[PDB]
């Protein structure tokens, strides 16, 4: 609706309060950090998509300083590039999940620098 009046198009083939959006975003990040063998990759792609969409939708855009502290960001970075989760052909979540993580982080950074 906002388009007729692209990075998340790989699935389909308004003004919001600041505090509750920040709380649900940081809880979504804590959900991301608590992803084990019970959780799956499609849930990861969809939570990344909804995280990027809520981050870009809220006015003003939520930045990462109020999203993650140093240990959470360090865990995310070692999750993205370290070979404790990116070893072999079974790298974290598969290439689709890595691409989705990259797109969500890129969207949040682009929202920060507007």
């Amino acid at each position: 609706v906002e388009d007729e009046a692209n990075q998340w198009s790989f699935i389909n083939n308004f003004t919001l309060a600041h505090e509750r959006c920040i709380s649900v975003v940081q809880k979504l990040v804590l959900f991301l950090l608590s992803m084990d063998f019970t959780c799956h990759a499609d849930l990861l792609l969809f939570v990344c998509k909804v995280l990027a969409r809520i981050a870009n939708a809220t006015r003003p855009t939520i930045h990462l300083c109020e999203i993650v502290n140093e240990p959470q960001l360090e865990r995310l970075l070692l999750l993205l590039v370290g070979t404790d989760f990116n070893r072999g052909d079974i790298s974290w979540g598969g290439a689709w999940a890595q691409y989705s993580l990259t797109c969500m982080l890129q969207d949040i950074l682009a929202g920060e620098l507007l």
Partner: protein, 214 residues
Amino acid sequence: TYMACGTCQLSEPLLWFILRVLDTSDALKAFHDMGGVQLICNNMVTSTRAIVNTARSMVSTIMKFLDGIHNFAPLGTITSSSPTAQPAEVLLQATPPHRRARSAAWSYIFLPEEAWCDLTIHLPAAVLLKEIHIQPHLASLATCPSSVSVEVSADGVNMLPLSTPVVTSGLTYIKIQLVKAEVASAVCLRLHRPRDASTLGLSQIKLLGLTAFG
């Protein structure tokens, strides 16, 4: 010492060898004597906490239909960096008629200074590309490219090569398989000038792979 120092890498021949070297009773006794099973248990705990499941769950099944390797060339578009005499979209057909091969489906003319020509294929979305198929002209494959380099780009803007240009002179069918399937949205085929021909003739380009939910 290899399993501990490796997290650890464990393959099918390694599993069979570990099962074969632990065949005797004394092997199991010696394995337990110097602390092997506890390290194994720690490895399962660390690996289970490490790797998330990659299997398709119910969400992909119940969203796949709300909206077996398939071709993706007809979905995308094609372009070239140099103005050719004819567009190369005829190469993008699912199956063009290959029965007579009169002249060529697509032809390219080389300037004396240039040796490489690039065909950039832009897909509407990034796909898990697995293998490229290039069919040169079958009636006269003198116009087949001497060598072809395949380059992939996931974002569609950061142009980026895949490997060394493979020599296809004398090849009727070009099959460039990938050991690692790559998420790519743009594919550049840089074709080299043939060994003794100034023209290129091609029939059909295929883009084989999967999608996120296919």
